Design a protein around this nucleic acid. Structure first.
Ligand SMILES: Nc1ncnc2c1ncn2[C@@H]1O[C@H](COP(=O)(O)OP(=O)(O)OP(=O)(O)O)[C@@H](O)[C@H]1O
Ligand SMILES: Nc1ncnc2c1ncn2[C@@H]1O[C@H](COP(=O)(O)OP(=O)(O)OP(=O)(O)O)[C@@H](O)[C@H]1O
Ligand SMILES: Nc1ncnc2c1ncn2[C@@H]1O[C@H](COP(=O)(O)OP(=O)(O)OP(=O)(O)O)[C@@H](O)[C@H]1O
Ligand SMILES: [Ca+2]
Ligand SMILES: [Ca+2]
Ligand SMILES: [Ca+2]
Ligand SMILES: [Ca+2]
Ligand SMILES: [Ca+2]
Ligand SMILES: [Ca+2]
Lengths: 16, 311, 311, 311, 16, 16
DNA sequence: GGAGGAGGAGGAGGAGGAGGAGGAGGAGGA
């Protein structure tokens, strides 16, 4: 199965 | 990116057939073009004539003819190399881990095979300006040694949102070699929906040593491994990801040999041999590559992933 | 806990087949799902088509696909770490002996491999609030050095019923390497009936050194050991127990190396090197781990098991 | 006592096969049950199928499964501990020399290794009420320093028939390491016919230092010694005798180390370090044990064997 | 074989 | 070989 | 109505283990 959070597209990791 | 296989419907393919190509693992036009006629005949609904048409139309959407070394040198000069988090190691690789290819790292225990994979899993999300690939990370794990806390450490070093970094790493645990290959077919489905830069199999050979224990199971073992490596090349050509597999070692009877035989050695374009140095430092050697000289480097495993030797 | 293999009958499997899966060593749905198609074909009554159905139905009851590092980091933050009875040692391990994984402790003689195993055998029965695992202890012993009086000593320290503590430690003595593997199949049967938190093999390699004496028996030795370690990982993934194996050492010819070769080194996720200190104090070093830095600690063997250095 | 191997004939084994198991050194059902399948295949007449049946039937006559620490604590609370003829020494060992286990005594010259073995050779014949084992004594001697007059001295102290005491000590002199191992196979034959309580090898390592002189003979030396120690454990588990071996020492280059390497150190459950005191007094230290604390005592070599320090 | 006391489930060790 | 006196069973040592 | 015949095609590595060995005197004085 595909996790509903793994199906989401690549979001650029913000700065911390 | 690659073209979704739905684009075959705008070319004369019945959408009922594109659905049958979907269950066979084909989700892009490239995957269907790169496929043999034989592979499509093995599908149920597909006939001899359909595969001829499906291949003919797929051939038009993706170029499969000759070009010049000039055009290929130009296209390769734009290829992404993901940083290993170590200046001395990136210089050995002349940029970093090269995409569209299979890289293998082998060595003894503790030598940093899992630690490099955890650094690569983060630094693949960096913008290309910082040495990344601007894509997600896929981490197929066959040992159970995936630690998300080691990702958060590498994230802090590059000042990235640890929560966002953990959202871009797709993780699957493989329990046997059949499952390990099955996970690659789902990988092909996911890589169309989202952008992935790096695929990690750690370890790509660990489960083969015990799934095929016998003396007469040796041919069946290397054949099953050859198909897995052939499928990794498929994902590397289809999506342009960087495939990084790890390998275990063995002792020389007549001093450390990677397992997998000639199959794993011919298939991997770059082979990285990792030794234990002193303390936290390790030594990476170019063991096989088409373009890099047989040289060595010295990196270290630090509290924030793989970095340069701190001394 | 895991799902009993009987739950396959409510999914389309003939109860006569579930009984055949039982004699092959499968007692949970997870053990059947994690198994290869090849492993089920080797069973007598099971055919090619049955294994396809058995695997398909088992696949539905246990998740074997991708998730995110977020979901995996959340699930791992709830994992049990059994206390080693030593604050300084637990701090080295960042909590204690981690479940669902193979931990190996090696060292010279007297360095406390059997003494840590006797402390762990008790402290695994403690409530999680006190640092335990709230499960039974399984102690496979290959040397004959299992002392229940050392358990009663650790029980008094934690103020537990010594009679009740001895009732939660299942003890088996292995006399050769074939028996040592056979005992693991019975272990899988027991771990469904009762809750176990910790599995101890002491020593996991002692009998391999003399069952396979020859020069040409080396491959057969490491292959048989690889299957044993592969089966320990099975129990760790199936039941979530903490597998703690011990290992003997050897001298460097060209200063103490653990035996078992690369097989034992790649398989164990955490390797603990124990040295002799002064008097009753010992020194534990992180020799290999996916998440812990290469550091050291100082514990002691006291009249009540492993504790902190009393000085 | 153990069950004679003849009891396999009442279970489906051809008496012609039991005779073949006899020439291979198996004289009890336990010795055959504890044996690997591999060990029986190496016999001439025995086939793959026979060993499967022989092991299956042997498995039914002797328990080789799990029990509880309660049942094992109960069974161990009934174990015999032979007196060392010294109150202060017996208190150090918490009862005396424990049966069913390998005890090793090492030290410099004159420190009483041969003198304790001569006291143990007599006091093993005492009734259990007096601290004995009510069995015969077997004394494998590799140095030539077996003195029956030292037995008669210990007999007078306990008021036993010196002629009867010398009738219960079976003596063999080993001239090399091959002979030393060969004598253990005959030991297994004798221990079925008569009741033995104690087995003494003095010294267990003296001949290994010169049979394997070379630098490259080191692995072959420790391997041959490992098999000898593995066979001593066999006799201790099969017949429940107390195995007491002695060991010589060496100087530290970088102050007294026992010889035999890690093989002898891992194999022996109790290691006794003997020092020279003043006059006739000696100092025994617990060097390694699963249950005894690292402590010391002070015994003496008197005109009637090992006793307490007379002062 | 399985001991009849080892087949029994985990009982929380009482306080002494 | 086995001595004919070593083949004999354990006799309890008498008192002297 | 009738009347058979034609072979061929290799491949696939893996597996560490094993300590031991002491020695060497000297220097008067109120
Ligand atoms: N947080 C950390 N800080 C420093 N060093 C660490 C940290 N986590 C792990 N290490 C070190 O990294 C090494 C582990 O490397 P890694 O997990 O990559 O092993 P590996 O090559 O995959 O081994 P194996 O074959 O056993 O799986 C060990 O030396 C360990 O001590
Ligand atoms: N009750 C006790 N109190 C104090 N120290 C003890 C006690 N029991 C054993 N010890 C000490 O613990 C050590 C024995 O450790 P342990 O039994 O774990 O050995 P090990 O590492 O398994 O060795 P081996 O390789 O010989 O099996 C010895 O130093 C011994 O003196
Ligand atoms: N009848 C006796 N009465 C008193 N002391 C004795 C007597 N017989 C031997 N001894 C003393 O016992 C010591 C000999 O001990 P033993 O024979 O056990 O040596 P060991 O430890 O085996 O030495 P080695 O390594 O030389 O074989 C010597 O000090 C010797 O003087
Ligand atoms: Ca790893
Ligand atoms: Ca290659
Ligand atoms: Ca031990
Ligand atoms: Ca490892
Ligand atoms: Ca002697
Ligand atoms: Ca020992």
């Amino acid at each position: 199965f595909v996790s509903p959070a793994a199906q989401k597209a690549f979001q650029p990791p913000r700065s911390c | 990116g690659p073209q979704p296989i739905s684009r075959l419907e705008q070319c004369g393919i019945n959408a009922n057939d594109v659905k049958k190509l979907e269950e066979a693992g084909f989700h892009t036009v490239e995957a269907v073009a790169y496929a043999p006629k034989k592979e499509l005949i093995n599908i149920k609904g597909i006939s001899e004539a359909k595969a001829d048409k499906i291949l003919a139309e797929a051939a038009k959407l993706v170029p499969m003819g000759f070009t010049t070394a000039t055009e290929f040198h130009q296209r390769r000069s734009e290829i992404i190399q993901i940083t290993t988090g170590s200046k001395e190691l990136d210089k050995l690789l002349q940029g970093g881990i090269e995409t569209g290819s299979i890289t293998e790292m082998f060595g003894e225990f503790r030598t940093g095979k899992t630690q490099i994979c955890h650094t690569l899993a983060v630094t693949c999300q960096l913008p290309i300006d910082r040495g990344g690939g601007e894509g997600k990370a896929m981490y197929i794990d066959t040992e159970g040694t995936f630690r998300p806390e080691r990702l958060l450490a590498v994230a802090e070093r590059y000042g990235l949102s640890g929560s966002d970094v953990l959202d871009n790493v797709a993780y699957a645990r493989a329990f046997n070699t059949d499952h390990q290959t099955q996970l690659l077919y789902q990988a092909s489905a996911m890589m169309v929906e989202s952008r992935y830069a790096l695929l990690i199999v750690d370890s790509a050979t660990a489960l083969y040593r015990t799934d095929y224990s016998g003396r007469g199971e040796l041919s069946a073992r290397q054949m099953h491994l050859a198909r897995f490596l052939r499928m990794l090349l498929r994902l590397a050509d289809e999506f342009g990801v960087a495939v990084v597999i790890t390998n275990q070692v063995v002792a020389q009877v007549d001093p450390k040999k990677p397992i997998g035989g000639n199959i794993i050695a011919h298939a991997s374009t770059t082979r990285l041999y990792l030794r234990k140095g002193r303390g936290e430092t390790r030594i990476c050697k170019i063991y096989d590559s088409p373009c890099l000289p047989e040289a060595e480097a010295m990196f270290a495993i630090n509290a924030d992933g793989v970095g340069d030797a701190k001394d």
